[PDB]
Amino acid sequence: MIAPMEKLVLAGPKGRAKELLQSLQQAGVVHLETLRPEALSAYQLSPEERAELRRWEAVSAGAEHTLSLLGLEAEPARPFPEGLEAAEKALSPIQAHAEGLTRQKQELEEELALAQAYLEPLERLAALAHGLDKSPFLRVIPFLLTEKELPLVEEALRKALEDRYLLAHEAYAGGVAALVVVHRKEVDQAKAALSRAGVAELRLPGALGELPLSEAARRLKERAEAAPRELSEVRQHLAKLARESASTLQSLWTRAQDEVARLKALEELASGRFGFALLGYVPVKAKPKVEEALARHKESVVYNPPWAKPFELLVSFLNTPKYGTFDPTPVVPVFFPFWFGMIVGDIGYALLFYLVGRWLSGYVKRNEPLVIDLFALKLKPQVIGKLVHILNWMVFWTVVWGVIYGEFFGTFLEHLGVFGTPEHPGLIPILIHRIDTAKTANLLILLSVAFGVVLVFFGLALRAYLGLKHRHMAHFWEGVGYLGGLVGVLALAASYLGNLQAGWLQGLMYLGFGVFLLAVLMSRIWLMIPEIFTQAGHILSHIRIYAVGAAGGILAGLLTDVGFALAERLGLLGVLLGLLVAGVLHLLILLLTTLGHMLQPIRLLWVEFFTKFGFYEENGRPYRPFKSVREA
Amino acid sequence: DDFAYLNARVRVRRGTLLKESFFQEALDLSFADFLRLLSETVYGGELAGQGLPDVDRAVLRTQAKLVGDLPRLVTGEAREAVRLLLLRNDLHNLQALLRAKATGRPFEEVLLLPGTLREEVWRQAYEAQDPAGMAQVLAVPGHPLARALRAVLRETQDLARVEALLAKRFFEDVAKAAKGLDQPALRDYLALEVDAENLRTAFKLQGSGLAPDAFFLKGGRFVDRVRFARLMEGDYAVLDELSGTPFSGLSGVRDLKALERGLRCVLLKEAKKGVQDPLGVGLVLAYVKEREWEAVRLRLLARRAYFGLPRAQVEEEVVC
Amino acid sequence: AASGGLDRGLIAVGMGLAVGLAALGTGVAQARIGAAGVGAIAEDRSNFGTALIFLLLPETLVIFGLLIAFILNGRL
Amino acid sequence: AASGGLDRGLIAVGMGLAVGLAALGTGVAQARIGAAGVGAIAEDRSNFGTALIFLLLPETLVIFGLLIAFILNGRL
Amino acid sequence: AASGGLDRGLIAVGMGLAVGLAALGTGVAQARIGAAGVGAIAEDRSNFGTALIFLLLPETLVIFGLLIAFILNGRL
């Protein structure tokens, strides 16, 4: 137990090292570093201190362990004090009760199990045996054999014994409990004969077995009978202990735990001051003032909605400095339109996604493991479930928004906004699709295609800021220079992009535009220039992902159309209810698969994320993957 | 191809066992009786008369004729893989030759297990004086260990250190080499060996707790340099933190002998996975391991029987 | 229906090649990658995403077929 | 029934092509994974529900065939 | 239904094709998946109800053929 103060633990980036350092130091807080290389070599904890820590571990662990056997738990909170002695003492009686009873319960189950099982064979043998292991004049060898065994066992026995033995059996079920009876002196041959056959003298293993067959049989009735009842008591006490003491167990546990970490924190700083993070021991007087602010970069242990919620989490990754260009934070608002807009469905697609959203944001007990959804109950990881309760609401809003993207989308089908097509039909709106037919369809084709290009433009802007402002000249040279090519790209594109609408606002413009491209790739020299080919490949990919996100999207709406509306023959009316045979079915299948579509937004994003357009990852590289960053 | 043949050849081969009950008898079998029991079994086919050196010799030959035959077959992907296993023990043998070579100890007393390279390679290597020359000999037919030995030899010609740094380096070569297949099971068992070797080495070296990595062989998958280090610092709590890891029978163990037993069981449980593994190397691999496991018990029990040594003396160690 | 236009036929043929080839390709792509996985499922319910993540990239191909089919429609 | 024009003639074929082809794709996809799958059951009956779910996605090919076979007949 | 016009010859050929192609795929599927299993079975007798269910999945392909063929002929 150190000199008075509550230890505080923080770790973070280089920027937070400083902000943090200042915040602890001025008040009258002690033993602070990084603030010198190791004057905590003159704060090396005593062996005694290490010992106290050691004790705390026994207690900490003991609580956990005991909680386990008991069959209940506790979970980590915010540290608190009690005194070690109180906690140890607290831990001890209960651990002793729970532990004793847990064993007893186990034994009881076993007693029951064996005794019932053994009850029948011992009884069969006993009934036959009319007492003979009682006798030494006759010796009896019980053994069980199936009737599979009986002619063979009989031949082996017969061969050794002749007729100087009694082989009798009364059945046990699927075989017969058997006795070979022999005279004294015949015993040795008698065991060997059964053994040769592969059978052998059978009774229960250990002390109970030795007892007369008759006696063993009695015991088996008794143990089998006794044990469940007895089990109830042992189990009851245990259950009772868990029930009452759980809070307590946890409080000791938490208390102890907070010490185990706390003590360790002291030891390491003592020892060798770490680096970009920040240690200290902070007094009772000092302790709140430093903690309230935190500047969003570290990790501690003390002692409208659609736009904000995941967006709030990207804010934390903005704050870390470790390089010379802007931190990676744009992603959540880049995601959102498409996230909502993936669902751009019709009658069965977008407009049915609702059922799920109120179930998940709300609570649904309909499910075999899901009960109250706030409580994350799952056949899959529970822990994982709790965190994205926040998400259930943001997803519910997504479900609401996707429904909206059903009526704007449905403009170019039915509705009103840019087209005039009936504001609402009479039978099944979206009987068939305007979009299935080419002109409407075509506009949607061109629509995705542009969007992949847009994500590329954002990336190279970032690229030039990166190499510029990080002074990665090779990269700077790359982000500006690569843009040199583009005018010529537009040139060629136009004669196919409007076909008749364009193609000739530019031409052999490419011949000089291509030169502009390569100029500074060549200025750095770069003994590996051809490699720019791959930068071009991404563009086609960006397009493809959006295109698929759309097309698979469209396909989704069209299954409600061949699943409820029109398809069969040339397309007919009664297909409506012929398909209803199918109709209930298509809905659920559809639901499962569209989840696959939303991983494509992210697939698109993944193209951009590791392509060094304001990023720290580059197949690793000190910083946590982006994988972990975006999820909630 | 030819693991159609191999698993099948193995399927027949797996029968010549000396059952668990063999060993149970042996606890209760005197040496003569132990010997009698052996002579009636497949080891008995290499046993002439009675006597321990003969039992052990019988073991070598028994393993040899059913497994040792196999390295000459090297042709399948699998055969090469099997070659790696044998190479490792043999790598020991090679070390035995190297060390023998260094101390004026003659070539002649270093038995080798069935070798990929023949007697004459070993002889030449021994006979090829310079540490480079010895290493160069082993390379003549090809031997990733030759080159590795050389790789280590490039910096100095200090035999013992070369052997030590080589063993780490070789198991490092092996890590790539085993990866260079695929036929996972050998790879898996080996991975457990990496972890096991780390545990025992840290164990051997514990209380030293120096710069751990010189003794930490890499390829830990549930073990790491620090866990190794901690154990080497004397912190036994590592095994208690290496629980729920694949190695559960080591939990709370504080002796190397029992440690080796638990490890053997864990790894054995892994070896046992192969029983009808196709090109997947498990059926042959497991089979080699069976012969191994049998051999361990036989030799142990042979002595037990020989000296009349307790049942309790063998009791931990002839079961897993 | 009935006697198809000479034009309708040229596109109608090619309509099939896109759906069949991509569909076949996706199933097989998923199958080998799918084959490697199984010990992990057992081991870690949480890690499960990796084998799964693997499957998603091939998924683009079939969808591509639908897009070209879409432009053709009303000529077919 | 009876005679058919060029659309009908083209579709009549494809109703068959569809049913045969999907089955073939399903089988190949199944062969690699299916071979892989079994050891896990032996070990774990518990995971078996997961396994029961596990095999399923390539199998989708067959079902598409029945709807399309249905659709073709009637332009046939 | 027996001899007739232009449509019918086309369905009659393809009716067979439906059956033949699916049969090859099912067989291939059984060969790899089937091969792994027996050792697992050797150990796990336990699996036997499961074993009746496990093998069962590629085989659906054949059933798919009988409806399309029957409905085609043996129903036309």
**What is the full DSSP assignment across A66-101?**
HHHHHT------S-----HHHHHHHHHHHHHHHHHH
- With 0-12 CB in 10 A as exposed, 13-18 as middle and 19+ as buried, what is A542? buried
The string of DSSP letters for A198-261 reads T----S-SSHHHHS-HHHHHHHHHHHHHHHHHHHHHHHHHHHHHHHHHHHHHHHHHHHHHHHHH
Experimental method: cryo-EM
Contact D26 C30 (CB under 8 A): no
**Residue of B276, B284, B287 to mutate when probing chain E, most E C-beta within 10 A:** B276
Counted residue by residue, chain E has a size of: 76
Angle at A489 between CA A438 and CA C65, to 5 degrees: 35
A527-533 contact pairs (CB < 8 A, 24+): A532/A482
Q: Locate the chain B residue with the closest alpha carbon to E35.
A: B278
Structure tokens at B106: 């003659």
CATH, residue C50: 1.20.20.10
What subunits make at least 3 CB pairs under 8 angstroms with A?
Answer: C, D
Q: First vs last Cα of chain D: how many Å apart?
A: 8
Tell me which chain D residues have a C-beta less than 8 angstroms from the C-beta of A573: none
- Range of the structural domain that residue D49 is part of: 4-76
Q: Are C74 and A558 in contact (CB under 8 A)?
A: no
* Cβ–Cβ under 8 Å, residues A283 and A26: no
- Provide the pairing of β-strand A176-183 with A138-145: antiparallel
Helix axes C6-36, D6-37, angle to 10 degrees: 0
Look up residue A129 and give its two tokens: 């045996």
Distance CA D30, CA D33 (A): 5
Question: Rounded to whole angstroms, how far apart are CA atoms B125 and B146?
Answer: 10
Segment (H or E) for A390: helix A389-409
> In this complex, is the C-beta atom of C67 within 8 Å of any C-beta atom belonging to chain A?
yes
The 10 Å Cβ neighbour count of residue A136 is: 9
User: Given its phi and psi angles, is residue B206 left (phi above 0), alpha (psi -120 to 50 degrees) or beta?
Assistant: beta
Q: Which of A438, A569, A603 sits opposite C73 (nearest CB)?
A: A438
Cβ–Cβ contact C32 with D under 8 A = yes
What is the token pair recorded at A605?
């994003």
Residue A398: count other Cβ atoms within 10 Å of its Cβ: 21
Diameter over CA atoms, chain A: 120
Q: CA-nearest residue of chain D to A568?
A: D71
Q: Give the C-alpha separation, A568 to A43, whole Å.
A: 84
> Is E42 touching B (CB cutoff 8 A)?
yes
Q: What distance in Å separates the CA atoms of residue B237 and residue B240, rounded to the nearest whole number?
A: 5
Match 């092509």 to its residue by tokens.
D17
Instruction: Find all residues with CB under 8 Å of B200, minimum gap 6, and list them.
Output: B256, B259, B260, B263
CA distance A623 to A43: 31
Amino acid identity at B91: L
Dist CA B111 CA B113 (whole Å): 7
Cβ atoms E61, E26 nearer than 8 A: yes
Q: Please, are residues D35 and E36 in contact by the beta-carbon 8 Å criterion?
A: yes
User: Is C57 within 8 Å of chain A by CB?
Assistant: yes
Q: DSSP assignment of D28-53, as one string?
A: HHHHHHHHHHTHHHHH-STTHHHHHH
Residue of C nearest to D24 (CA): C24
Q: Name the CATH superfamily housing domain B182-279.
A: V-type ATP synthase subunit C domain (1.20.1690.10)
Specify the residue for token string 């120096």.
B210
Find chain A residues with C-beta within 8 A of D73's C-beta: 569
User: Do residues A99 and A288 touch, judged by C-beta distance below 8 A?
Assistant: no
Contact C60 A437 (CB under 8 A): no
Name the token pair of A370.
Answer: 């899901």
CA pair distance B47, B56, nearest whole angstrom: 9
Contact between residue A171 and residue A165 where contact means Cβ atoms under 8 Å apart:
no
Tell me which residue has tokens 């949480």: C46
Task: Report DSSP state, residue B155.
Answer: T
DSSP assigned state of B71: G
Chain A: nearest CA to D70, how far in angstroms? 7
B contact chains, 3+ CB pairs < 8 A: E
Sole residue written with tokens 């076979």? D69
A567-A570-A572 Cα angle (round to 5):
65
Residue A222 C-beta-side C-alpha neighbours within 13 Å: 7
Write down the architecture of domain B1-75+280-320 according to CATH.
Orthogonal Bundle (1.10)
Residue A134: C-alpha distances to residues A210, A214, A248, A303 (Å): 11, 10, 56, 72
Residue B241: strand, helix, or coil: coil
For residues A27-61, b (16+ Cβ closer than 10 Å) or e, as one string? eebbbbbbeeeeebeebebeeebeebbebbbebbb
Residue with tokens 């409080």: A251
Phi, psi of D17 (to 5 degrees): -60, -40
Query: What CA–CA distance (Å, rounded) separates A233 from B151?
Result: 69
D74 phi, psi to nearest 5 deg: 115, -10
User: C69 vs A434, A436, A584, B315, C27, CA distance in Å?
Assistant: 15, 9, 27, 74, 21
Cβ proximity of A374 and A336 under 8 Å:
no
Q: In this structure, are residues B41 and B18 in contact, taking their beta carbons and an 8 Å threshold? A: yes
B50 token code pair: 């009675």
Interface residues from chain A to C (CB-CB < 8 Å): 380-381, 384, 435-439, 441-442, 444-445, 544-545, 547-548, 551-552, 554-555, 569-570, 596, 599-600, 603
The continuous run of DSSP H or E covering A10 comes out as strand A9-11
Tokens for A242? 């868990």
Helix (H) or strand (E) run with residue A140 in it: strand A138-145
Give the Cα separation of B294 and B67 in Å (integer): 13
Q: What is the DSSP letter of A46?
A: P
Contact A470, A325 (CB under 8 A): yes
Amino acid at B130: D
**CA distances in angstroms from A180 to A146, A153, A212, listed in the order given:** 15, 10, 15
* Structural tokens at position B254: 């504080």
Q: A511: number of CA atoms within 13 Å, CB side?
A: 2
Let me know the angle formed at the C-alpha of B142 by B137 and B145, rounded to the nearest 5 degrees: 80
CB A254 within 8 A of CB A80: yes
For residue E38, give the H/E element and its range.
helix E6-43
Give residues with Cβ within 8 angstroms of B77, minimum separation 6: B181, B183, B279
Query: Where in chain B is CATH 1.10.132.50?
Result: 1-75+280-320
Give chain D positions within 8 Å (CB) of C15: none
If we measure between CA atoms, which residue out of A278, A259, A303 comes closest to residue A31? A278
CA distance A439 to A104: 79
CB–CB contact C60 A544 (8 Å): yes
Query: What separation, in Å, do the N-terminal and C-terminal C-alpha atoms of chain A show?
Result: 40
Write out the residue limits of the CATH 1.20.1690.10 domain(s) in chain B: 76-181, 182-279
Q: SS3 of A501, please? A: coil
CB-CB neighbors (< 8 A) of C74 in chain A? 436-439
Q: How far is residue B262's CA from residue C51's CA, in Å, rounded to a whole number?
A: 33
Put simply, the answer to whether A441 touches C71 (Cβ < 8 Å) is: yes
Q: Which of A444, A548, A570 sits opposite C64 (nearest CB)?
A: A548
What superfamily in CATH does domain B76-181 come from?
A: V-type ATP synthase subunit C domain (1.20.1690.10)
Written as one letter, the residue type at A454 is V
CA distance B276 to chain E (A): 5
Breaks (C-N over 2.5 A) in chain D follow: none
How many structural domains is chain C composed of?
1
Kindly give the pairing relationship between strand A281-282 and strand A6-7: antiparallel
Indicate the helix (H) or strand (E) that contains A282. Answer: strand A281-282
Could you give the dihedral angle defined by the CA atoms of residues B165, B168, B173 and B178, in that order, rounded to the nearest 10 degrees? 160
- Alpha-carbon distance A403 to A408, whole Å? 10
Angle at B59 (CA atoms; ends B53, B61), nearest 5 degrees: 105
Q: Do residues B284 and B11 touch, judged by C-beta distance below 8 A?
A: no
Question: Reported resolution in A?
Answer: 7.5
**B262 within 8 A of B247, measured Cβ to Cβ:** yes
> Closest to D57 (Cβ–Cβ): which among C9, C13, C30?
C30
**What Cα–Cα distance (Å) separates residue A246 from each residue in A60, A81, A232, A383, B4?**
15, 18, 20, 20, 59
Which two structure tokens, joined as six digits, stand for A480?
Answer: 């500006």
> What is the DSSP code (8-state) at residue B216?
P
H/E stretch holding A145: strand A138-145
| CA C75 – CA C10 distance, rounded (Å) | 10
Report whether the peptide linkage leading into residue E60 is cis, meaning its omega lies within 30 degrees of zero. no
Q: How far is CA A311 from CA A131, A306, A461, in A?
A: 84, 9, 22
Cβ count within 10 A of residue A479: 22
Distance CA A154, CA A158 (A): 6
Q: Is-contact A52 A262, C-beta < 8 A?
A: no
CB–CB contact D23 E22 (8 Å): yes
Q: Do C74 and A437 touch (CB under 8 A)?
A: yes
What token pair was written down for C28? 């097989």
